[PDB]
Amino acid sequence: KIEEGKLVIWINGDKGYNGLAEVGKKFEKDTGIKVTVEHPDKLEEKFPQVAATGDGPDIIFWAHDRFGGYAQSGLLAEITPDKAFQDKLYPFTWDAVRYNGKLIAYPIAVEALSLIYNKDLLPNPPKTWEEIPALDKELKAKGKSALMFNLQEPYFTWPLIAADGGYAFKYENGKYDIKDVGVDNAGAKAGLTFLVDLIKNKHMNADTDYSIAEAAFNKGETAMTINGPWAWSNIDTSKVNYGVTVLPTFKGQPSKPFVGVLSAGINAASPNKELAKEFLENYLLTDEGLEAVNKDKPLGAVALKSYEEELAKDPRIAATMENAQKGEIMPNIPQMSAFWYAVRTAVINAASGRQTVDEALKDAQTAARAFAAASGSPADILDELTELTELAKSVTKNDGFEFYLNTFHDVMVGNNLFGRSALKTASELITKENVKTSGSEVGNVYNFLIVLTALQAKAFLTLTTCRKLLGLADIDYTSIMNEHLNKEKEEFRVNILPTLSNTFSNPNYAKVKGSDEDAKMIVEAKPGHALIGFEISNDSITVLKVYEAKLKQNYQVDKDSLSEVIYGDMDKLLCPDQSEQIYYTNNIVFPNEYVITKIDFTKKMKTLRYEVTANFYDSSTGEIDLNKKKVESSEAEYRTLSANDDGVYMPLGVISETFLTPINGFGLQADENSRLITLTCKSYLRELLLATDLTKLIVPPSGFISNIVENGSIEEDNLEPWKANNKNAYVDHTGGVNGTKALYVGISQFIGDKLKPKTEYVIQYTVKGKPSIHLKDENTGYIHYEDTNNNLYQTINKRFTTGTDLKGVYLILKSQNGDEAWGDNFIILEISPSEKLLSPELINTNNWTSTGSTNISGNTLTLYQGGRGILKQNLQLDSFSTYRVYFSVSGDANVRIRNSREVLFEKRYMSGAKDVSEMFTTKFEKDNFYIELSQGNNLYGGPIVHFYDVSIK
Predict the structure, then answer these.
(1) Distance (Å, whole) CA 905 – CA 899
(2) Where does the sequence pass through the membrane (predicted)?
(3) Breaks in the chain, named by the residue before each, with C–N above 2.5 Å?
(4) R_g (Cα) of the chain, nearest Å
């Protein structure tokens, strides 16, 4: 229940509250806004008590170290000072008031411990710490001590300890790493050891409190003391002429005192956030405002650059600022509470002799880190429970995770089921639910065994760590786990693996319309490589991924040589449009030492054949012979698929074993009723598994390897070829797509030499907003692909070709007519070349043979009336191929294409037949085939017959 139109300020009583009230009176007399400055006791503890319920002051004045804990609970409002105002204050003071990249308070003053000395007895103060023990003896004879400061609090003894490299929490990238504590390093040891040695040599007293130290110095009983600007007011009254200088250096390095920044935060529950902003930015953080506070009680150094230059004329303020820059900014995280207790107890124990410096700091680093799981049993048990919950989510994407847990338990207690082992009954369930899944039975069941043993390994690992956490006696569960493991391997190898099938097919289908034109597609591996995996996916474009790689011993894939080649126009074959398509179907299977390296698809005259090449593979050397080949094809058995204007259901999904392995079988099946086209292959996984039981298997990648765009997905480290253009291009907006990073707008990346001239590519990107994506040559201006102004994340997928202009091609993401745009997961893919079906002419003029009266005049073939003419030309045909005879005929003629035994085509035209186009096919017989032009009858010698434009391709 806060009021509006009024400002209420809470500032500590040690501050100049009367001066801040005078600035408030100036604020009210210029704006009408009442400013009430209150100085409550326990102000650091009372603010979170009242602010948690929504009440409290509008502005809170305290050191920045406690404002992180306030921002933790969302008690401070995010201030929004413009860039012009931010430059009026020192940049290091803005970092003290920054929490998780958010500004939470305005910095007012800067304070830090400094060396205070008595000029009457010490004209020049000692520059280094090591001089103090020597100089102490020379003044002890005169009845005085050298140095006396507060030893009970660690805030005072820390600059000496942190001199040689001590630190509370490692500061990196604006974040305090709670797992890195620097109290037990060599630097902190040397620091505290010197402090203890000063006490052992009776140069300092381990019981000196704040009161004892201040009294000794202000009455000239000691030469030096360490204190802050707050202590100046009390020595001013004593008139003991004092100077404030830099702190002594230790081991050549300067003392590092903690730096406190007096900050003014705005209550996140205050309804006067605009009123508070005006008071702080325009009235308090000014030369007149800070001076008014300074006149009441000194502020020391100030964050305002303007007024600090005026204050630096005082050597005391210049010294506090000098010491502050040498020291380290106080961490504002709440874990400092453990740090303070750790160092406070360590210095006390080390001074009193209860512990040595090595012992005090070792447990101090344990206590400082205590808010994070200590390395060992506590840290591991948390990592093991998290890794186990990930394994749970791995097998709950609809069996279930509890199925694995039940099966795992049944193996441990030796609970056999249905007479066979529990692994067998679990395996039979795998082959009864994974029937429409990528991979074969060998792959799917072996994958089940991998997860089962991975859970088995974690269960035994969790047990071991749980016993260490409980202080229980060590037990080595390695042999009892290995015993269970070998029993599981033996069961799968002898009882489960042989009865499993090694055939895998496509898991899904997609209703798709292709083309009716002839087409060729040759999937071939590089010399020495083998085809190892396939994936068909159709999102507006049909893309075929083929995986090849070198082979190692026993059908293992060479991870170093794994390549991914992209083939386009997969839908253009396997699918007709408005017409029929004949699919020749023969399951090809090679012997047990040959690996498929080449699949040759041939679409000719609405017929689809394939010819598979398999080279010989050696199980002792990784060599695949380039000359010991075997070639089989879809020979003669054909299925016919009617026109059906609504498509043909192309095969979709991952045609691969669950682990990338070579294949020795391939076949296409087409159902004449359901129009389902099914690709099926046989895998080498069982031969691999039977030969090696030593996860060196490779899983078929989900995304596209060989992606031309580097860093395409922007979810990696700042390593990126993307270049921002020196504008508001926003390197890495974290919180983009799905939660991950995304490009905000612009950004450009050079691809350039990775492109090929006059080659077809596929671009894909998930963008939102109004993006202007261009793939243009920044030298000639040639645009290879453009995505101009388009409406509101969607994954656009288009296919394009480049031309002759590549030595400057960039992928540029910018916006249209000044708007914003987000783009993620850019993909550019090369489409390996396909080749045009070469159907040559098989009829030549000089290859005709005559019987009877005939005549050959150009394109006209004439069978004379009286002469019983028969023309015959031999045809050079292949074993399993589709051809087409074309001609026009006028007389009563009979065309027939025949061999000594087989006939491919025969028809009698007892009338004019213009533009005849008949297809014929060969079945394993290719030699001694000929076309025979003759008359339909031979009565009276036959009628006159003219053949026009005879052609066979």
Answers:
(1) 10
(2) none
(3) 398, 694, 745, 792
(4) 43
